[PDB]
Amino acid sequence: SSPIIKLRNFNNAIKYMLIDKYTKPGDVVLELGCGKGGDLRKYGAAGISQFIGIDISNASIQEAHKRYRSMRNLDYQVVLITGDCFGESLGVAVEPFPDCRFPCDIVSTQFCLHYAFETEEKARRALLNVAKSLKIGGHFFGTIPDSEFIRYKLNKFPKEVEKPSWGNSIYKVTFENNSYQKNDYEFTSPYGQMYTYWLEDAIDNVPEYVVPFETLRSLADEYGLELVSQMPFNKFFVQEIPKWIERFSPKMREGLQRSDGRYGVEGDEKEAASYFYTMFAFRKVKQYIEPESVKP
Ligand SMILES: Nc1ncnc2c1ncn2[C@@H]1O[C@H](CSCC[C@H](N)C(=O)O)[C@@H](O)[C@H]1O
């Protein structure tokens, strides 16, 4: 109905499309930054065997527990853990939860990996956490702001603007500084490139960090993860929607359909959801061995 509701419907559609594209029956899923568990139920149709949700917010995990408790137990085991997925090794978080079945098949980071790019140390710790958790042949997928859209918008500001900002009725980005423009329209470093993000009734002016996708790809490769797909939300939706029209309920279709009959978003939610964000998927191709770790 409202632009922000259509954004939420669209992003939920994206997550269904992403999860069901790469997740297989029987998979063990590690959901990092799982929040209140809003995607827990999206794995049911995929037929997974175990969902491990980790989030740094104990309040969100408590709410995840409460929402799961009122649910009848699904066909998969659910493990919900309060823990820092980006600034600490995952072993600390999951050690009290021996039911976790590692190595897993899927690592999912939905709308959260960009918080790991606060520093190189945190970005590397997050990606090592992802890589070490996975089987060879496992997949790492997720959703982050598209650095190429961010660069496109940043490139429009003259160097004199001290705090480049843009948005529309439902979102706003405010960069901490103009170092990008002063640096001939390139980030001075891949990490800690901070902007405050506002999303109506979702994110209340919280700092987050650009994820220059070439750096995410380079780091992933260093830790044994090969890019399978990276697509802005609008192009991913176009690619997947032909197989999903029949799967969505009537109300779900109605909440995704435009007046010209196509499915997707228009208006302010078009930029806020379908341009601002990209999906990605990596496959683990080799086991990372820490440099100089093999001793006599
Ligand atoms: N270092 C960190 N470790 C784990 N979770 C983190 C984190 N930094 C941020 N988060 C979590 O990232 C989440 C972003 S909100 C997205 C929640 C969920 N993945 C969904 O798509 O609905 C929040 O729950 C926040 O607490």
Residue numbers in the entry: 140 to 435
What's the paper's own text on this?
The essential enzyme messenger RNA (mRNA) (guanine-N7) methyltransferase catalyzes S-adenosylmethionine (SAM)-dependent conversion of GpppRNA ends to the m7GpppRNA cap structure characteristic of eukaryal mRNAs. The antibiotic sinefungin (SFG) is a SAM analog in which the S-CH3 sulfonium moiety of SAM is replaced by a C-NH2 amine. Crystal structures of K. lactis and S. cerevisiae Abd1 as binary complexes with SAH or SFG and ternary complexes with GTP•SFG highlight how SFG makes two hydrogen bonds from its C-NH2 amine to the guanine-O6 and -N7 atoms of GTP that account for its higher affinity vis-à-vis SAH and SAM.
We co-crystallized ScAbd1Δ140 with 0.7 mM SAH and determined the structure using KlAbd1Δ137•SAH as a search model. The final model was refined at 1.75 Å resolution with Rwork/Rfree of 16.4/18.6. Electron density for SAH was observed in the methyl acceptor site. The two structures are superimposable with an r.m.s.d. of 1.1 Å over 289 Cα positions. All the atomic interactions of ScAbd1 with SAH recapitulate the interactions observed in the methyl donor site of the KlAbd1•SAH complex. The C-terminal 10-aa segment of ScAbd1 (aa 427–436), which is dispensable for activity and which is absent in KlAbd1, adopts a random coil conformation and projects away from the core methyltransferase domain.
